[PDB]
Symmetry: none
């Protein structure tokens, strides 16, 4: 306990989104909102190298050059095993994909990290479900 402060680096639009939300919801500062976002994401992260089942929801631009190959290459090296996938064409530029996969905590978390950072991927949320053999 105590209080320590560290610096956070953002691009403009993430900052814009954050400041817009602060103003609408009557939050007092950036420090408070981020603090509450950290404390919440930490708690909701719910899960030994035992294999598990999880769900990865991805939203991306379908006409992006070789993005699918990019995602395939990533999950092939991931060590995870894919069970099922569904592709929803939400929009002209938006594709929703749900992926049911199994692996250990680390591979599954890592798969989300790498898929999230690809250009053309705008959303990549992981739902940790349960132990699974």
């Amino acid at each position: 306990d105590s209080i320590i402060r560290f610096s956070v680096s953002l691009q403009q639009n993430l900052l814009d989104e954050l400041d817009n939300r602060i103003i609408k919801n009557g939050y007092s500062s950036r420090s408070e909102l981020v603090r509450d976002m950290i404390r919440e994401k930490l708690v909701e992260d719910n899960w030994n190298d035992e294999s598990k089942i999880a769900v990865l929801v991805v939203i991306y631009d379908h006409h992006q050059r070789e993005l699918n190959q990019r995602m395939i290459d990533i999950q092939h090296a991931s060590g995870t095993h894919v069970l099922s996938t569904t592709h929803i064409h939400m929009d002209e530029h938006n594709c929703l994909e749900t992926i049911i996969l199994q692996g250990n905590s680390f591979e599954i978390q890592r798969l989300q990290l790498e898929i999230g950072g690809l250009r053309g991927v705008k959303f990549a949320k992981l739902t940790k479900a349960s132990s699974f053999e």
Copy 2:
């Protein structure tokens, strides 16, 4: 350059838990992890607060339940039918005798979707019920 830096005051207790995930999960920095959490929450916020009555919102419901307990599935279908949402797709994976994992892709306004998730979560035999909000980007 193109990057803005601002300061976050915080409990050492909270800082340590955050630093643990960075090390545990192989994150490059605090900023990248914090950025990612913020961006996830901010997006989900906008999903529920802009055009709240838009019927074209899409979300994914992930449920784990016992499928060999009586009336549970029917009860769940009853609930979905009164929700006012539309099911786009569903997948069931039978994990074992007492556990089934299904993904449901929904469409409706934020209220209907959030009430559906709530009614299904409260069910006896439904062990797990978690919703992801899917939004269209420009």
